[PDB]
Structures are given as structure tokens and as C-alpha cells.
Amino acid sequence: HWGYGKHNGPEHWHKDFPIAKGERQSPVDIDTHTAKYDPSLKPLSVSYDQATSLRILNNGHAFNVEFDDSQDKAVLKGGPLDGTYRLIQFHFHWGSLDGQGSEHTVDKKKYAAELHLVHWNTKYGDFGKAVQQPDGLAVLGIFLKVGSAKPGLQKVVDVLDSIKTKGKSADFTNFDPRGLLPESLDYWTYPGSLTTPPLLECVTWIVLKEPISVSSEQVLKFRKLNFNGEGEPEELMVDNWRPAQPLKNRQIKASFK
Ligand SMILES: CC(=O)O[C@@H]1[C@H](O)[C@@H](O)O[C@H](COS(N)(=O)=O)[C@H]1OC(C)=O
Numbered sequence: 001h002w003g004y005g006k007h008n009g010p011e012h013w014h015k016d017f018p019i020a021k022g023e024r025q026s027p028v029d030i031d032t033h034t035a036k037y038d039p040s041l042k043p044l045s046v047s048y049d050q051a052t053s054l055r056i057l058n059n060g061h062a063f064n065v066e067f068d069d070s071q072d073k074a075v076l077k078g079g080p081l082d083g084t085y086r087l088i089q090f091h092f093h094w095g096s097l098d099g100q101g102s103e104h105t106v107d108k109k110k111y112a113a114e115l116h117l118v119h120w121n122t123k124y125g126d127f128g129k130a131v132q133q134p135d136g137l138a139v140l141g142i143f144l145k146v147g148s149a150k151p152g153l154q155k156v157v158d159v160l161d162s163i164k165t166k167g168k169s170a171d172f173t174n175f176d177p178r179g180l181l182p183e184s185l186d187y188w189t190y191p192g193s194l195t196t197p198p199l200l201e202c203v204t205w206i207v208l209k210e211p212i213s214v215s216s217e218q219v220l221k222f223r224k225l226n227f228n229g230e231g232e233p234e235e236l237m238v239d240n241w242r243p244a245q246p247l248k249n250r251q252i253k254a255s256f257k
Pocket residue numbers: 059061062063064090091116118139193194195196
């Protein structure tokens with residue numbers, strides 16, 4: 001099926017997933033000088049105090065830190081969002097080199113990686129139904145640049161050795177996603193899609209202006225993961241990012257001037 005290699009990569013997805021060429025695909029390039037400050041946006045509210053992480057899994061495309069979303073334990077509200085969006089998982093996209101890896105770009109600039117915290121609109125009862133709605137999901141995107149270490153990320157980095165290959169998973173309780181946030185919640189926002197198949201156009205993207213720094217040693221460990229299952233020839237997990245798509249009939253709004 002789909003992947004990021006030369007033969008199954010994003011340039012091919014449209015064949016199985018025609019929506020790949022759709023009205024509101026992600027990611028996109030964020031042109032800081034075309035984005036419009038929107039004074040009517042409410043402050044963004046990240047409420048990750050009761051967050052309950054459960055497990056980390058290598059699914060052959062990325063690794064997912066999964067959260068207990070049977071209740072409003074960790075939610076996202078405010079900003080451009082209507083209602084309550086519940087945290088289900090976070091994951092990353094990254095490159096084979098520090099100059100690439102992010103999905104969204106800022107004035108065409110690629111970051112070394114991009115963290116995605118995925119939430120679903122609780123008005124729809126479950127994730128499956130929410131992906132079928134134009135306001136079904138809210139993904140909080142955070143850029144990673146290489147520099148000094150992010151201590152809050154290190155717990156994640158150390159467990160990757162135990163989920164090297166596709167299908168593997170490890171326990172991952174008591175992780176606090178608040179340690180992954182930058183100091184500022186200034187953001188850009190636009191309507192978009194999942195960035196992997198099925199590429200459903202159900203996402204309100206919230207992309208933070210301020211990157212977090214991670215060390216080269218931290219990102220290197222991301223790059224030791226495998227796309228392949230155990231006992232197969234090694235395909236390093238790198239460059240699992242979709243390039244920017246056309247903005248078309250959309251506007252990006254900023255929470256700041
Ligand atoms: C459970 C799972 O497979 O998660 C996917 C995975 O984390 C990652 O490859 O990105 C996808 C792309 O989503 S992302 N980039 O839009 O936020 C995720 O897909 C979805 C449906 O959550």
C-alpha cells in the first residue's frame with residue numbers, strides 16, 4: 001500500500017485516494033505576509049492536565065503516542081475551534097537531514113521535523129465519525145528545529161529502541177505532552193486535511209508560530225527507526241512527510257500581528 005518511498009510516495013497517493021487533489025488538502029506553505037490577523041479568534045486553550053498516555057506504537061509510517069480518550073482528560077478548545085476536541089494521539093514527521101522534514105513550511109522554509117497533536121470533536125462521539133466531518137479534527141502542529149535538547153522529549157527518545165520496527169509497541173504511561181509545547185501559543189490556522197491517506201478533509205489545522213528546539217542526538221534517534229517489520233531488510237524511517245499542497249480557495253488566519 002502507500003508510503004514515502006520513490007514508488008509508493010505522496011506523488012502516487014492520488015491513484016488510490018483521488019481526494020489527494022482535493023479542495024482543501026494539507027500540508028501547505030504558510031506565507032507569513034499573506035496571512036491575516038483575526039482579532040475575533042479567542043485565546044487558544046490547551047488543557048492537558050489530566051492527560052493519560054497509554055502506549056507508543058511503530059505503525060510503519062510514524063510512531064504514535066496514544067492517549068486515553070474515553071473522557072475529556074486532555075482537550076483543545078478556543079482559538080478557531082467550536083466545542084471540545086479530545087486528544088487521541090501525537091506523532092512526528094521528520095527528515096533524513098536537518099534541512100528537511102516538516103510538512104508545513106513557513107515562507108517555504110522546511111524545519112527538521114514537525115510534531116502533530118491530534119484531537120477529535122467530541123460532538124461526533126468517536127474518531128471514526130469525526131473524520132467524516134469538515135470540523136471533525138483539530139491538529140496542533142509544532143515545528144522542530146535542531147539546537148539544544150528538549151528535555152520533555154527525551155522520555156520518547158529513550159523508548160524508540162524498543163519499538164524499532166513496524167507493529168512493535170511499548171507501554172508509555174504517565175507521559176506529559178505539556179513538555180513538548182513552546183512558550184508561546186501564537187498560531188496560524190486554516191481548514192485542511194489529514195496528511196496521509198485516506199487524506200480526509202476533516203481537519204482544522206492549528207500551526208504554532210514558535211518552534212521547539214531539539215538536539216541533533218535526539219533527532220538522530222528518530223532516524224534509527226524502521227519503516228519495515230522485524231526481520232526484513234532495513235528501510236530507515238526518514239522523510240515521512242508530505243510536501244506542501246496548493247492553498248487554492250483558502251485563507252490562513254493568524255492569532256497575532
Ligand atoms: C492512528 C494513525 O494511523 O495515525 C496516523 C499516524 O499518526 C501518522 O502517520 O499520521 C497520520 C496523518 O495524520 S496527521 N498528519 O494528519 O495529523 C495519522 O492518521 C490519522 C488518521 O490519525
